Design a protein around this ligand. Sequence first.
Ligand SMILES: c1ccc(-c2cc3c(cn2)ncc2ncn(-c4ccc5nc(NCCN6CCOCC6)sc5c4)c23)cc1
Length: 312
Amino acid sequence: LSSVRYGTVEDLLAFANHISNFYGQRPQESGILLNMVITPQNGRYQIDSDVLLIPWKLTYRNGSDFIPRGAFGKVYLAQDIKTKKRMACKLIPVDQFKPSDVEIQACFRHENIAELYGAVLWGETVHLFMEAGEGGSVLEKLESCGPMREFEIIWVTKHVLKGLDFLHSKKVIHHDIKPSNIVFMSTKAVLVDFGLSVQMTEDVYFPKDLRGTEIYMSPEVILCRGHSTKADIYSLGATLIHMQTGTPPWVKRYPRSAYPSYLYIIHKQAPPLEDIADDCSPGMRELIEASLERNPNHRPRAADLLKHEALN
Ligand SMILES: c1ccc(-c2cc3c(cn2)ncc2ncn(-c4ccc5nc(NCCN6CCOCC6)sc5c4)c23)cc1
């Protein structure tokens, strides 16, 4: 409350609720750390003096760069100067900070999901220290070495589906599955960015605002008339197209302009079966076109997709 301390998920959530309930006062540290990732100095965790914070920007070279709708804050690369340990840092202001920004990552832990290390308030900014992938993002790999080979896609898709299956079993819709939100580790691929993620109360989720990245959006998400976890499956299909072609589903056929109409194009023409790569196995084609299925009730679950012939 007055200083940064080590705590539980309960301590973390109690702090998040207090922040959501005064500028010009001396900036003092306060918050809860779930993991001991910041080296203390004189019995304090002084992130302003001991944590190296630099903006984390991705170099986009293909128009494969879409700003997420309803997104807030900034992504920074945080590094504890003493241990030289790298972490991701989601910087959110006090007024915009609410308990949903941490709830998913703090309560639901899985191998294919990025771990939440803690939340530190310093002045007017709340710092969300998270697990970082030492091997970069899927987008970085695509922009660097070009379109991915089928075996490399199968390896990533197997890991992504395990993380989706987990979140979908806990009734959580990720809402932003894109190559930039899938990162590489030494033995796995992990899902990041839980800012747009919601926990489902009932069988159908009714959004108040249109949130997410437009090119990977399903036809039911654009409509805002209700959707479920199946929305993430369409987005996976859209990322699968991005992985094998080097560009997301609609960008090539319908170029980028100051007057875009992608929400209309997806609604009138989805699934993007024309954007699927010409040189891909019949099994892999079958996997993509089923995940892009127009009707969410006829689209497979993450558990069904893991059992597919292409992956095995
Ligand atoms: C939120 C919190 C943490 C991460 C994150 C990124 C990682 C990582 C672990 N975690 N491990 C390795 C890695 N190699 C590159 N990246 C990387 C770096 C920056 C980056 N920015 C992205 N999006 C820009 C849009 N912002 C707008 C504000 O709201 C959030 C989204 S995706 C993205 C991905 C990463 C991502 C988002």
